[PDB]
Design a protein around this nucleic acid. Structure first.
Length: 187
RNA sequence: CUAAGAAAUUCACGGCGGGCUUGAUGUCCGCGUCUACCUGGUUCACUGCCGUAUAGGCAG
């Protein structure tokens, strides 16, 4: 939008696709989760759904000051020695449809869905008939894993973004702040 | 377009009485199993969820 950023994670053993570098792709958004910051546009610049990975670099869409000096949260650590590092730049001057990043798009509703199936004062024999498992179905959400209390290794993810605009502006805010609808950088 | 072409074996029955298998025995003796290794390929496509409705500070 106003200042699009990137973060290069270098290749190594510890950043392979198993659990040292698989789970740090859709759950490591501590700059928009824990390290400080909540009003950015999530726009991953590696949206290639063939490998099920909607982001290659650490693509983030922010403003001019938020990309130049207002993006110093702890959500960019590990790239000091175990990877490379990025910096801020200008926003998309052309019309890039980069309204897709790590956002609140995901289909893991079976983690707590017994209240929507059989926790409504009934027994447990209606966990798929009254309220089905159709929302707790894993699908091809192109997005890196997550490292929360769901497995010792990484997890699943998704891309909660859509189209992008033609001007320079941060779009709408989802759970991950995925800046869909705003003209972020296309890649 | 075939060693082609076709076809109901059925009904009924008491197997049964008896038995001492015993005696004795030295398995001995000897040995090098070593050498290396990422389980971070999710132990529920998940552990709690507002409406099963890709609805999330989702605890990611």
């Amino acid at each position: 939008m106003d200042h699009y950023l990137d973060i290069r994670l270098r290749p190594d053993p510890e950043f392979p696709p198993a659990q040292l570098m698989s789970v740090l792709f859709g759950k490591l958004h501590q700059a928009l989760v824990a390290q400080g910051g909540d009003r950015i546009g999530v726009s991953f610049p590696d949206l290639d759904e063939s490998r099920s990975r909607l982001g290659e670099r650490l693509r983030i869409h922010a403003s001019a000051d938020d990309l130049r000096a207002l993006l110093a949260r702890p959500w960019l650590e590990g790239l000091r020695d175990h990877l490379q590092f990025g910096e801020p730049a200008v926003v998309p001057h052309p019309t890039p449809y980069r309204q897709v990043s790590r956002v609140q798009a995901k289909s893991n509703p079976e983690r707590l869905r017994r209240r929507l199936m059989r926790r409504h004062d009934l027994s447990e024999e209606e966990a798929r008939k009254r309220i089905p498992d159709t929302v707790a179905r894993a699908l091809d959400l192109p997005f890196v894993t997550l490292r929360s209390q769901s497995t010792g290794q990484h997890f699943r993810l998704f891309i909660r973004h859509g189209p992008l605009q033609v001007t320079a502006e941060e779009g709408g805010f989802t759970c991950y702040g995925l800046s869909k609808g705003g003209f972020v950088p296309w890649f």
